[PDB]
């Protein structure tokens, strides 16, 4: 019964809650766990939802390896690699 | 359409107390981060505050933080910013903005604002405070970033009595109902805002605003003039 669409989005919302916990607080480490986890296994970096984050995310160390400033730009890939888990790609 | 309304303004004393509202209608308010933006007697903007979408984060500018609190009610589809301890700094027009997207620091949508009048970090540079233009003219309206941006980067426009209104994001892309006299590009640390044809309503003061790096700093603004 369960959907592709629907998971995949919970999956991207879950990931933007941890992402948005990790940054604030130095003692919500479950939170930055979740977010290492998440950015090593999908090789990704990032919210596109909560891009304002970018900057914290990486100031925690949160995006230690992988190339996001594609151009002169950094492009937040974790939303499209939880899609690519999903559709079978990547 | 997206709708903001401001309440709760005043006269006020230093170190007093004023609740500012806003009541938000026309989108799924539960959807977006909102944010407080106040434009200071010298009108410069400055953004304030931010309530995560479920209301459980919360940012403050430095100056205002401990004094001010911002909360939701996405039952009422309404925000407060509850201020206290008064400074004369805190004199402005405090608008409530709609951020574009979740939580990327940019104000798609303003109210028109509510006074506060109080009685007796990366620099955005605009390098031109006005421009005297004729109208049919041309003019490339320059905003230099302290640190790379990365293409982060806002336009409002902002005509008197009237709050700013959005004409670009992301340095390049303009907001639907912008015409297409007006362009934006640069990267880096340099950008410019270029207006062709100059038609009457184009004469109001543009800002840029960086949306990197916490606090989401504005520039000065560039005032054009008719001659």
């Known amino acids: 019964f369960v959907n592709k669409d629907q998971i995949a989005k919970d999956v991207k919302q879950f990931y933007d809650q941890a992402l948005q916990q990790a940054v604030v607080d130095d003692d919500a480490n479950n939170a930055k766990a979740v977010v290492k986890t998440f950015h090593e296994t999908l090789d990704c970096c990032g919210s596109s939802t909560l891009t304002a984050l970018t900057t914290s995310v990486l100031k925690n160390n949160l995006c230690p390896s992988g190339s996001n400033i594609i151009s002169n730009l950094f492009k937040e890939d974790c939303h499209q690699k939880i899609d690519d888990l999903f559709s079978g790609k990547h | 359409e997206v709708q903001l309304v401001e309440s709760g303004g005043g006269l006020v004393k230093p170190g007093g107390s004023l609740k500012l509202s806003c009541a938000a209608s026309g989108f799924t308010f539960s959807d977006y981060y909102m944010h407080w933006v106040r434009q200071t007697p010298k009108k410069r903007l400055e953004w304030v505050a931010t309530i995560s979408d479920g209301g459980s984060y919360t940012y403050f500018l430095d100056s205002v933080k401990g004094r001010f609190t911002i909360s939701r009610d996405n039952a009422k589809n309404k925000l407060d910013l509850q201020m206290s301890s008064l400074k004369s700094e805190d004199t402005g027009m405090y608008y409530c903005?709609?951020?574009?997207?979740?939580?990327?620091?940019?104000?798609?949508?303003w109210g028109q604002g509510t006074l506060v009048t109080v009685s007796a970090d990366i620099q955005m540079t605009q390098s031109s405070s006005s421009f005297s233009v004729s109208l049919g003219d041309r003019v490339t309206i320059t905003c230099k970033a302290s640190?790379?941006?990365?293409?982060?980067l806002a336009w409002y426009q902002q005509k008197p009595g009237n709050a700013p209104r959005l004409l670009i994001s992301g340095a390049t892309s303009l907001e639907t109902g912008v015409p297409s006299r007006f362009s934006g590009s640069g990267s880096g640390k340099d950008y410019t805002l270029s207006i062709t044809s100059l038609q009457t309503e184009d004469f109001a003061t543009y800002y840029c605003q960086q949306y990197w790096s916490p606090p989401w700093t504005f520039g000065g603004g560039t005032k054009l003039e008719i001659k």
């Open positions: 640190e790379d941006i990365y293409n982060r």
């Open positions: 903005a709609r951020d574009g997207n979740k939580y990327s620091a940019w104000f798609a949508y």
